[PDB]
Paper text:
In our structure, the two dynein dimers adopt different conformations. On the other hand, the microtubule-bound dynein-B motor domains have a straight linker docked onto AAA5 and are in a post-powerstroke state (high microtubule affinity). In contrast, the dynein-B motors contain ADP and AMP-PNP in AAA1 and AAA3, respectively. The dynein-B motor domains are both in contact with the microtubule via their stalks, whereas the dynein-A motors are lifted away from the microtubule surface. However, 3D classification shows no evidence of any DDA complexes with LIS1 bound to dynein-B. In contrast our DDR structure, solved in the same AMP-PNP nucleotide condition but without LIS1, showed all motors in a post-powerstroke state bound to the microtubule. In our structure, dynein-B is in a post-powerstroke conformation and lacks LIS1 leading to the question of why it is different from dynein-A. Given reports that LIS1 encourages binding of a second dynein dimer it seems probable that dynein-B also engages LIS1 during DDA complex assembly. However, unlike the LIS1 molecules on dynein-A, which are additionally stabilized by the presence of p150, those on dynein-B are likely displaced by microtubule binding. This agrees with studies showing how LIS1’s interaction with dynein motors is incompatible with the microtubule-bound conformation and implies dynein-B is the first motor to contact the microtubule.
Cytoplasmic dynein is a microtubule motor vital for cellular organization and division. It functions as a ~4 MDa complex containing its cofactor dynactin and a cargo-specific coiled-coil adaptor. The formation of dynein-dynactin-adaptor (DDA) complexes is a key regulatory step in dynein activation. Here, we determine the cryo-electron microscopy structure of dynein-dynactin on microtubules with LIS1 and the lysosomal adaptor JIP3.
Numbering used by the authors:
A (entry chain A): 2799 to 3071, 3079 to 3221, 3470 to 3847
B (entry chain A): 1327 to 1549
The structure:
């Protein structure tokens, strides 16, 4: 109530006169900013909106409502020198200009200004305006805090001070930091947005030493000794500087307290539900962020994917689309359909994590940072695949040009007993030209799809990494079914491993210590195109050896959280750029919190990041990995926003697919090779064919009356003629092979289910007795001895 | 008759470009450069629609678009991390515009900063690593050139050394950091200097592992 009194008093301090409508507008704006800001449920906010208007009608009769009560009620101080009511559009334009100049100054991260982040920026500025204005920001991780605070602190001119906490932090050092902050904010009249974080502060012990600053803005007993003399000298100097002549100790201390009340602002960032003190809840103003809406995610995905070519004028709208943004422009274009499916993917995964939490499984928190990583992976993947397609199309055009040049050479060579066989040679080449032109048409069809196809890889890179194989496939089928519902053209059968990795990289991975499973290869392509630093869930320990095999040339060093000298290893890796593998992340030190969030700070030429007390330099070749041997863990939602999760664990579906592939390799290798060629009907066979075409072009243009010396180069052109026909064969014979491998795998499936049940009984047997411990190597040795060394099989 | 109007409007714009490019890169303040470029941008925006069909206005407009695109590359090229070595690598990969470090803005501006973006990205990445390494070596020199052995009294007989644990923690921290330094990719240019410090660092350990011994037993022997 006294914050309400002070807010209305600060609204009517610089104004000259008002009507009743402006006063009740100011009063209701402060009611909305003091009561609706802490609410979580939307129904409570609607109740507050109804009852504010009911109170304003009840206690103020014969007052015009629509002049006083316009429901987009906003107030600002940037557009004019007064705190007049403003509209939304001019405020949005000004904050977009300020955010665009905020891009190029200190941090190059693109931001999106939807409807709610504007309101939150207005609220943070309104807290910054009031004396004794302290803010507590609550809500899910990411989603605005420690980025909106820095933004409005830069905009209103407040410098930012943070405490760098580590193991060595006593109350004396906290007193020294508070002395420096209060001396800077009081004597120098420097506005400081002292922001505190959940990482560096969870319970530092002396969090109640700043309760007096939160109450009235002075610590008694902080300035004992010579510090009172120093503060008295600088206090009289500052009071002389701003023209307030005071003499004695007490009036100068009162002026110092008043200047601390006016200047120093404190903003806490806290994650929701030990519990904080209710005094700390009462001392601040409590702003609830919440999760981003469908409109906010639509506005993020629209502004971030606008640069990519998404326009299909051929696109026929379907009759009914599953819509989740109700304010979509009906009927949509292709880009609108893509962004609607982009937010549909996030909605379906929120529903899927809720359904997995209904069953009682271990679910991890889902943040807007996951949506940002999904959109960034979509943009990078779309650019990469379109660049590859345009490059190979240009190389095909070069090949066509040289083919026409060689045809011109041959019809020159018909001037001149080799005149028959050379005329035989031309009878290949133009036919080859025809085959090449047919491939051109296919690449046009490749455009049709390359867009939604990238979508179904990109989410698969960023979203479904923690899940098992069956849940990943179910999410994939849900995304594919919605994309067929929205007339988005994409490949009906996609190999997720082959799309994101070439065969040479797979040969490198299998040449390293990596098993050849579908789950393990998908979690290997997880570790190639990550944005955030990854965490591995491996119960077998193979992932650590795979990681040190993949990065041994960069001299990766091994460490763990449980070492005493861990933080120096992380500091040296951050400073010198050598990559780091960090074990035992169940004892998660929160000092990694900026590093996974990539919180760099441009201080002059320096690139500073906070580690311990130190501010150290992020070398650009740094990359880190976090590891769990232990699969039974529940991480904080803070850690869900900062890392990408991969799952090397073994489940029923993973071992069932492993046993099915093993028995089909061991018993029906014709079906296994016909299935493996169906995986090779994607980019492997075509990359080998295009490499052969490029090598033929390396000896095609050597035609100057020289090619008729023996007329045997046609075989080099005929070695292409067979294999491409084989590529023409297996594409034509591609449905019968699908049905054949489906029927043969259907014949062998209950053996795989029996193998999975036997293995899970073997791993469940540990609870009977302490000696009943059997590994996965035991069961694979069982399966090898049954399948290969069986004396009854002969 | 409109050619006089459009050329009289564009002559001051071209002159403003001329006094912008003549500013020395030694004396460039790039935030003020952004402010002046935005002043030129809103002066461009102030022009009416009669001149929007001529080629000269849109040519100058896309020139200013290229300039405010490369404004961030300018504000990063003015960083303190870049030294004369990285300027020599910019000479090596950029070929043209032989600059004697008289450092005009126009000669830096006329080269295609938008086309050759990955080149200056690699140069700034290398300079970032070198600045990180050099400031680590500065921290080594500052910390170990001013370290003092704390001395405490002993029975009005002697003056012993107190605080072996923090000193040994510092020696172990610095020696392991030099060991990780030798694994760093940016290692060569500073290499022998680090080696000299490494030698000195090892010598310090080679004293103090002795010292506690000739402390401790002697105290015990006195007892």
């Amino acid at each position: 109530m006294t914050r309400w009194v002070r807010g209305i008093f600060e609204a009517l301090r610089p104004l000259e006169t008002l009507p009743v409508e402006g006063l009740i507008r100011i009063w209701a704006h402060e009611a909305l900013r003091l009561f609706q800001d802490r609410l979580v449920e939307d129904e409570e906010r609607r109740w507050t909106d109804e009852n504010i208007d009911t109170v304003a009608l009840k206690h103020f009769p014969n007052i015009d409502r629509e002049k006083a009560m316009s429901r987009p009620i906003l107030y600002s101080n940037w557009l004019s020198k007064d705190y007049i009511p403003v509209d939304q559009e001019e405020l949005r334009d000004y904050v977009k200009a300020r955010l665009k100049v905020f891009y190029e100054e200190e941090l190059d991260v693109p931001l999106v200004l939807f409807n709610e982040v504007l309101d939150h920026v207005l609220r943070i500025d309104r807290i910054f305006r009031q004396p004794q204005g302290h803010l507590l920001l609550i809500g899910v991780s990411g989603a605005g805090k420690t980025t909106l605070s820095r933004f409005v602190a830069w905009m209103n001119g407040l410098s930012v001070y943070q405490i760098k906490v580590h193991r060595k932090y006593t109350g004396e050092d906290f007193d020294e930091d508070l002395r420096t902050v209060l001396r800077r904010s009081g004597c120098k009249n420097e506005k400081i947005a002292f922001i505190m974080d959940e990482s560096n502060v969870l319970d530092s012990g002396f969090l109640e030493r700043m309760n007096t600053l939160l109450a009235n803005g002075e610590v008694p007993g902080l300035f004992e000794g010579d510090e009172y003399a120093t503060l008295m000298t600088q206090c009289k100097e500052g009071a002389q500087k701003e023209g307030l002549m005071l003499d004695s100790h007490e009036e100068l201390y009162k002026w110092f307290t008043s200047q601390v009340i006016r200047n120093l602002h404190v903003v806490f960032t806290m994650n929701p539900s030990a519990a904080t003190s209710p005094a700390l809840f009462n001392r601040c103003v409590l702003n609830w962020f919440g999760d981003w809406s469908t409109e906010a995610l639509y506005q993020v995905g629209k502004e971030f994917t606008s640069k990519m070519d998404l326009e299909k004028p051929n696109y026929i709208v379907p009759d009914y689309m599953p819509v989740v943004y109700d304010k979509l422009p009906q009927p949509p274009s292709h880009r609108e359909a893509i962004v609607n499916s982009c937010v549909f993917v996030h909605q379906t995964l929120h529903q899927a994590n809720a359904r997995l939490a209904k069953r009682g499984g271990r679910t991890m928190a889902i943040t807007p940072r996951h949506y940002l990583d999904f959109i960034n992976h979509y943009a990078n993947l779309f650019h990469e695949k379109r660049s590859e397609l345009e490059e190979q199309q240009m190389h095909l055009n070069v090949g066509l040009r040289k083919i026409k040049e060689t045809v011109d050479q041959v019809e020159e060579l018909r001037r001149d007993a080799k005149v028959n066989r050379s005329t035989a040679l031309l009878k290949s080449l133009s036919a080859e030209r025809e085959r090449w032109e047919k491939t051109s048409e296919t690449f046009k069809n490749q455009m049709s799809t390359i867009a939604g196809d990238c979508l179904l890889s990109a989410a698969f890179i960023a979203y479904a990494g923690y899940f098992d194989q069956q849940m990943r496939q179910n999410l994939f089928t849900t995304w594919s079914h919605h994309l067929q519902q929205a007339n988005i053209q994409f490949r009906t059968d996609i190999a997720r491993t082959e799309y994101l990795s070439n065969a040479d990289e797979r040969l490198r991975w299998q040449a390293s210590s990596l098993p050849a499973d579908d789950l393990c290869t998908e979690n290997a392509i997880m570790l190639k195109r990550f944005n955030r630093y990854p965490l591995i869930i491996d119960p077998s320990g193979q992932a650590t050896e795979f990681i040190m095999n993949e990065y041994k040339d960069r001299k990766i060093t091994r460490t763990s959280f449980l070492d005493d000298a861990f933080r120096k290893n992380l500091e040296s890796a951050l400073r010198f750029g050598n990559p780091l593998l960090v074990q035992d992340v169940e004892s998660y030190d929160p000092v990694l919190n900026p590093v996974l969030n990539r919180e760099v700070r441009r201080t002059g030429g320096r690139v500073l990041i906070t580690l311990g007390d130190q501010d150290i330099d992020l070398s650009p070749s740094f990359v880190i990995f976090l590891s769990t041997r232990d699969p039974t863990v529940e991480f904080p939602p803070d850690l869900c926003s900062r890392v990408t999760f991969v799952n090397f664990t073994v489940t029923r579906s993973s071992l069932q697919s492993q046993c099915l592939n093993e028995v089909l390799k061991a018993e029906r290798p014709d079906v296994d090779e016909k299935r493996s060629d169906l995986l090779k009907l994607q980019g492997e066979f075509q990359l080998r064919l295009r490499q052969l075409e490029k090598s033929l072009l390396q000896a095609l243009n050597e035609v100057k009356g020289r090619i008729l010396d023996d007329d045997t180069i046609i075989t080099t052109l005929e070695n292409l003629k067979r294999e491409a026909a084989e590529v023409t064969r297996k594409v034509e014979e591609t449905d019968i092979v699908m049905q054949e491998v489906e029927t043969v795998s259907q014949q062998y499936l209950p053996l795989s289910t029996a193998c999975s049940s036997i293995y899970f009984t073997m791993e469940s047997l540990k609870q009977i007795h302490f000696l009943y411990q059997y590994s996965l190597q035991f069961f694979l040795d069982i399966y090898h001895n049954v399948l290969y060394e069986n004396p009854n099989l002969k | 008759q409109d050619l006089k109007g459009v050329w009289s409007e564009l002559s001051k714009v071209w002159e403003q470009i001329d006094q912008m490019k003549e500013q020395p890169w030694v004396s460039v303040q790039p935030r003020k450069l952004r402010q002046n470029l935005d002043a030129l941008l809103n002066q461009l925006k102030s022009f009416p629609a009669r001149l929007r069909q001529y080629a000269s206005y849109e040519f100058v407009q896309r020139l200013l678009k290229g300039y405010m695109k490369i404004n961030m590359l300018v504000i990063e090229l003015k960083s303190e991390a870049l030294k004369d070595r990285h300027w020599k690598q910019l000479m090596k990969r950029l070929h043209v515009n032989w600059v004697v470090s008289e450092l005009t803005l126009g000669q830096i501006w006329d080269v295609d900063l938008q086309k050759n973006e990955a080149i200056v990205k690699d140069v700034l990445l290398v300079a970032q690593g070198e600045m990180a390494l050099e400031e680590f070596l500065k921290q080594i020199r500052e910390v170990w050139n001013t370290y003092e052995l704390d001395l405490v009294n002993y029975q009005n007989k002697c003056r012993l050394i107190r605080g072996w644990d923090d000193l040994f923690n510092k020696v172990k921290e610095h020696i392991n950091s030099v060991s990780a330094m030798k694994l760093s990719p940016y290692y060569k240019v500073f290499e022998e200097d680090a080696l000299s410090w490494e030698d000195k660092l090892n010598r310090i350990m080679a004293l103090f592992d002795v010292w506690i011994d000739v402390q401790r037993r002697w105290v015990y022997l006195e007892g």
